[PDB]
Amino acid sequence: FEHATTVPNVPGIPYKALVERAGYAPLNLEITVVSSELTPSTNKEYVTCKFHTVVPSPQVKCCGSLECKASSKADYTCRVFGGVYPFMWGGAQCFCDSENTQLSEAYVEFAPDCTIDHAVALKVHTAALKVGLRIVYGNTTARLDTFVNGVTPGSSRDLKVIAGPISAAFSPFDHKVVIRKGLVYNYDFPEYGAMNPGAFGDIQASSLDATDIVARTDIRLLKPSVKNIHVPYTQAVSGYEMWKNNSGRPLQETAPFGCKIEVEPLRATNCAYGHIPISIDIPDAAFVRSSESPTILEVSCTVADCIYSADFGGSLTLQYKANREGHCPVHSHSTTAVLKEATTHVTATGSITLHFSTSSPQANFIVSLCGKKTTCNAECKPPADHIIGEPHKVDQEFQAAVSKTSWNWLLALFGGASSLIVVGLIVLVCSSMLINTR
Amino acid sequence: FEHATTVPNVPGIPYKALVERAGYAPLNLEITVVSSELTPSTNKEYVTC
Numbered sequence A: 001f002e003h004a005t006t007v008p009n010v011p012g013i014p015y016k017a018l019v020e021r022a023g024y025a026p027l028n029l030e031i032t033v034v035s036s037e038l039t040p041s042t043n044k045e046y047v048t049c050k051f052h053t054v055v056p057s058p059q060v061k062c063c064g065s066l067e068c069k070a071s072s073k074a075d076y077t078c079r080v081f082g083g084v085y086p087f088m089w090g091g092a093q094c095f096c097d098s099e100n101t102q103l104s105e106a107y108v109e110f111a112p113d114c115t116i117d118h119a120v121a122l123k124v125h126t127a128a129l130k131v132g133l134r135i136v137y138g139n140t141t142a143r144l145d146t147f148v149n150g151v152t153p154g155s156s157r158d159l160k161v162i163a164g165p166i167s168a169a170f171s172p173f174d175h176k177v178v179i180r181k182g183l184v185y186n187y188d189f190p191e192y193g194a195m196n197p198g199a200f201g202d203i204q205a206s207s208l209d210a211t212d213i214v215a216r217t218d219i220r221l222l223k224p225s226v227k228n229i230h231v232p233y234t235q236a237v238s239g240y241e242m243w244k245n246n247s248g249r250p251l252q253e254t255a256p257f258g259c260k261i262e263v264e265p266l267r268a269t270n271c272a273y274g275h276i277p278i279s280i281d282i283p284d285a286a287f288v289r290s291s292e293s294p295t296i297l298e299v300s301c302t303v304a305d306c307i308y309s310a311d312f313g314g315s316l317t318l319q320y321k322a323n324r325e326g327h328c329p330v331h332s333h334s335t336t337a338v339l340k341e342a343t344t345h346v347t348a349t350g351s352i353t354l355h356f357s358t359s360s361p362q363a364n365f366i367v368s369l370c371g372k373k374t375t376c377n378a379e380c381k382p383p384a385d386h387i388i389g390e391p392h393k394v395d396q397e398f399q400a401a402v403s404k405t406s407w408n409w410l411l412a413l414f415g416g417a418s419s420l421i422v423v424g425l426i427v428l429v430c431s432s433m434l435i436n437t438r
Numbered sequence B: 001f002e003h004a005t006t007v008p009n010v011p012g013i014p015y016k017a018l019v020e021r022a023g024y025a026p027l028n029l030e031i032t033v034v035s036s037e038l039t040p041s042t043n044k045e046y047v048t049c
């Protein structure tokens, strides 16, 4: 049989339900969302890391001429200079009365440390959510893991179970992101082929070990200015360390709902938000006919004591009369309250307690023992402790915090002035006629 | 758990109380003031004889 139900997106929050079929005892169904797995689609754009300038041996043409030539190396620079003043420990490298000239050039390349200090700029889209569900029926536990989509049931025992789509779409990830040393940072990285000195991603490459590179970081050559042969180079500070210094806090400290983000899939997990509708198919053989089910008689409830606690602290008791030994389930069709155990033994005239929780102080509702129903009411008090991180609000508040006494007072407050005005008008018209008599 | 109660100053007078907690049986609490000890601060002034 197939049953439909909506569940909150949250871990460690079992949800209990029942299936009604004529001649079959209502079957307890427990559903647990073990964890969440939001995996988006992303594409590798480029990589960046601290670089190193190249300072190759300059070219010296003595007492003659020469011309500059470009080079395919990324961020390359070249420039000639006449009237050079070459000196070295060995002395004047060559000789002519200041006629000689020298060509200098430089370029950049990623340093060896980059191999492990690389930071990759990622473009992401189409967040996809994966949900793992564990379902208990007839004290039998089955499992499945399915994409949140409502069109691809998973495989578990060759059982087709579907979930979603989500009520709302949530994704902490933004279109542009960066990954560095296992830390993910939300930032609008410059597009590939865009070089801006003193900025993130100044050096860009298709792959870490790509021979072809493109970069621009405003390198300007300086004229020789000293005795010896030297190439003074002026360049802006590397942008990688710049972004490192003031990169801001990591996404791990900014993700809403406490998403637990992992890097190797670049995906979130254990993050709770939204609702999920699901349809569960259960084999008919799993069901049990009511003929063999225990029969109960003259059952009654009693709230020994309840507390309006965030955690599961509510208690209840039931007393029953029966004729057959065995087990029956227990349920509460009121969403405001949730039980703890789904089934229990049954005796001829036994009475058993129950643990439960509620989201309202007016503990009035209907609970079913085995197949039969029964009303049960009480009032609950706020707790002394008022800060706890354990599961809370298994059912969200439904403006039911208002008390029965509050309803009685509000009813006694509003007055029936409409009846007063109606009676006044009626007597007024009657008197008007009586005086039209004259 | 913490509970507040007022007791008379007197020996050999047990006082009984209960603590109410949801889902917990009320726990009997007996309190006895075995004795009193009023100790003041004093300073030696001098001696005579």
Ligand SMILES: *[C@@H]1O[C@H](CO)[C@@H](O)[C@H](O)[C@H]1NC(C)=O
Pocket: A138, A139, A326, A327, A328
């Ligand atoms: C499940 O509950 C039924 C109901 O009494 C019982 O007969 C059966 O033995 C239970 N299964 C297990 C594995 O305990």
